[PDB]
């Protein structure tokens, strides 16, 4: 939407217009204001269905957890669903031969790494040095809320050396009204603030921060730095919502196809 | 750095080679291929944009990167192809992909964001994912090419490694880039 | 979704899986189709909300109907709405004194050919020849339905030199459960099939035929739209085209038609 009536794309046209057919221009600019009410009523309804799902959710994303963590054997009718698809001709086969069962891998190791590093967009928040930090990852989940309005994801840690946390939380405060001073601009759910977490380094192990030289502590790049949200800082909190959409919308609900890789990007 | 470019290879594929099958352990040695060759071609344009002017790797420096790791013929017809998809996709514009509107099947966008990742230089220009994209699409096409003759002169569809280790072995400058790998 | 196995991004790392691992991941591939047969559930429960939600929306679309048409009035606060934002100074009241009241100039003529215009993908569909033809619409309307799944586009039209149709109607039918013999693919609802209408043209105003009898560029072709499987190549992209139009008219230009008619809406 451009505020900047001048910038309008058919701006010459309305001056144009004689007044009587501006006044009506006027007229469906309100009632525009009043579709819009009405759309965000819509929206917060869409967000209690989603709440009203996640129990419909959980126990596909429970089961997969077990299995990630070994916690669960696979079934006859687990097994019997093929690793890949369009595969033909004894390459299924072959696959399924191409390496021994190793009892000493329990579960699925670095399954949250490497489903999160395929996906294109928190590849690029992902650094050399979250990697192994990553690997400790043994859940990601997300849950929303009513009061107050918005949702949250939370990163489950294994016992690691980089930090004490076992969980790290990111919280998303949501708007569901339109901006009363700018209410055509509405076009959905619209982030108020983020909210990170405290992450408890061991020492040398906070690789999101380093000195530089009198001597003071910048940001480094990281992918831990999603859990410190903040001119041009509205944005960076705009990056910051859509990384945390990607994680709960696209990630967490098809993680295996990230882990495999059978979801790709072209862009 | 274990980056796969198996799609995009196939795509390639099927332009040179449209009946014309590749095996996964074939494929597996061209994505190694591509990728010891994308590690060559940035770190030497990482080297000359060390201390450049705002430490910039734009296509200049993939262009002399180029003629520096890839032989002679390979290198002229690599520089042609660069400057050509650099040229489409100046002058070009639903939201088309920057491959698409440079006229490539390698990704243009994620060759943007390892040579950003890898921190070889302060900044990558638009241009240099292109022409980078350019190149290692070439080359791709070229051992594809190659190796698909191989594979019918075998009297086969399909791309096995012995296709492409005789394509690389028989090709003098295929043979001396692809030696090492 | 890459349906060829062997092209997926991390093929090599599956590959290289023990066995009793790959049969870990057997299993979240299998919960993963049950994943997305729970969103499909979802799905169906957001289009029954978007019907239910119809009775509130279409008094306000039914109230700008009658505005463009000239069939009411605007109201003190309508006329007190600007008609554009962001403007300063002098400019709102230049603008309403730059044109002279008009009489003889009703409603607001080219409203819905402006609106669908100024929409990049609908623009790319109107030839020179629909101009004239899509001045005579009045409204654009569209509704859903439960049984059969899907939802229509209905184009009013004045009386018009063109066609004797006062409505033209298009109709597409929506599958809302996953494919069986491809569940991992499903990512929302897709189109089954796309049902016209049949334009009864008066004499040589065909603008869809010409004789070079042929078929040529017309807005107008979107009312017979392509076949599916059973009513016959790369048909299936055609309809694909035609539905993401049909849903560009109805989720964006529909409820804010007045946005792309002053241009306040730009890509």
């Known amino acids: ?267 | 750095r274990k980056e796969s470019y198996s799609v995009y290879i196939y795509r390639v594929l099927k332009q040179v080679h449209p009946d014309t099958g590749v095996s996964s352990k074939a494929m597996s040695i061209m994505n190694s291929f591509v990728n010891d060759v994308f590690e060559r071609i940035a770190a030497e344009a990482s080297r000359l944009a060390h201390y450049n002017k705002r430490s910039t790797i734009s296509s200049r420096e993939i262009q002399t990167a180029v003629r520096l790791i890839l032989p002679g013929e390979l290198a002229k017809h690599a520089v042609s192809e660069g400057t050509k998809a650099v040229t489409k996709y100046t002058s070009s514009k639903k939201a088309k992909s920057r491959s698409s509107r440079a006229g490539l099947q390698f990704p243009v966008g994620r060759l943007h964001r390892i040579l950003r990742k890898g921190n070889y230089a302060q900044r990558v220009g638009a241009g240099a994912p292109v022409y980078l994209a350019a190149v290692l699409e070439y080359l791709a096409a070229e051992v594809l090419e190659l190796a698909g003759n191989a594979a019918r002169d075998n009297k086969k569809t399909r791309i096995a490694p012995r296709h492409l280790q005789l394509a690389v072995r028989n090709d003098e400058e295929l043979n001396k880039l692809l030696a090492g790998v």
């Open chain 1, 1 to 267: 939407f451009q505020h900047m009536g001048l910038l309008s794309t058919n701006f010459d046209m309305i001056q144009a217009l004689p007044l009587n057919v501006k006044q009506r221009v006027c007229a469906l600019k309100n009632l525009q204001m009043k579709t819009i009410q009405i759309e965000s009523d819509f929206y917060k309804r869409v967000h209690e269905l989603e709440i009203e799902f996640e129990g419909k959710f959980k126990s596909t994303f429970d089961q997969r957890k077990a299995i990630v963590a070994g916690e669960v054997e696979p079934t006859k009718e687990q097994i019997d669903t093929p690793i890949l698809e369009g595969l033909e001709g004894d390459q299924l086969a072959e696959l399924y031969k191409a390496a021994e069962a190793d009892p000493s891998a329990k579960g699925i190791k670095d399954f949250w790494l490497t489903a999160l590093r395929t996906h294109d967009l928190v590849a690029e928040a992902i650094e050399e040095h979250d990697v192994p930090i990553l690997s400790y990852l043994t859940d990601v989940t997300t849950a929303a809320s009513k009061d107050p309005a918005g949702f949250k994801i939370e990163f489950h840690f294994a016992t690691n050396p980089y930090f004490k946390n076992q969980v790290l939380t990111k919280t998303y405060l949501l708007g569901f009204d339109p901006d009363a001073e700018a209410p055509l601009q509405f076009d959905g759910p619209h982030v108020i603030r983020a909210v990170g977490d405290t992450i408890e380094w061991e020492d040398g192990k906070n690789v999101t921060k380093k000195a530089v030289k009198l001597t003071k502590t910048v940001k480094a790049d990281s992918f831990f730095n999603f859990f410190e949200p903040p001119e041009q800082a509205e944005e960076f909190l705009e990056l910051d919502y859509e990384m945390g959409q990607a994680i709960r919308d696209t990630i967490i609900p098809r993680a295996v196809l990230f882990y495999t890789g059978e979801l790709q990007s072209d862009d």
